[PDB]
Amino acid sequence: SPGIWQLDCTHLEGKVILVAVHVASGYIEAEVIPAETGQETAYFLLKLAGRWPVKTIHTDNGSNFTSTTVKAACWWAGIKQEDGIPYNPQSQGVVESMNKELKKIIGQVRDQAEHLKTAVQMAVFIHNHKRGYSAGERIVDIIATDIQT
């Protein structure tokens, strides 16, 4: 479905990386966040929802994903939050692979940047542009054919 995303909180170099994977395309949005809080999560969600037609978000039961601030963002932006892991092993497999690919690309470009925040953005660029369609072209195609129906 065009609006399903899975959100995951991962740790690297003593930092917190929030990762949104568009399940149907493998497209990634990721960012190093100051702390694993509900405010940083809600903020990341508002950014993502103002950019893509986000309908449903799958997340684990982490405190940062079940906080009021997050429920409020979801209410405000018209997002259905589906909290709880497992929910769908096939969908979760695709998401785990995309995260695995992203961490691999991070290692490959880590020495081309001082800060982890830069290296994450470099890896998202590489991931989304890698080809024979790229994830960046798959998401656009999925959303464009959805507006046509």
Ligand X SMILES: O=C(O)Cc1sc2nc3ccccc3n2c1-c1ccc(Cl)cc1
- Per CB under 6 A, does 87 bind ligand X? no
Per-residue binding string, ligand X, 22-61, x by CB under 6 A, is -----------------x--x-------------------
Contact set for ligand X, span 108-147 (CB under 6 A): 112-115, 118, 122
121 makes contact, choosing from ligand X, its own copies, none, with CB < 5 to 8 Å by partner type, with its own copies
What is the closest distance, in whole angstroms, from the C-beta atom of residue 89 to its own copies in the complex?
28
From the list its own copies, ligand X, none, pick the one residue 124 interacts with, judged by a Cβ distance below 5 to 8 Å according to partner type.
its own copies
Distance between CA atoms of residues 98 and 28, nearest Å: 8
**Long-range contacts, stretch 67-71, CB < 8 angstroms, 24+ apart:** 67/37, 67/38, 67/41, 67/42, 68/38, 69/38, 69/39, 69/41, 69/42, 70/38, 70/41, 70/42, 70/45
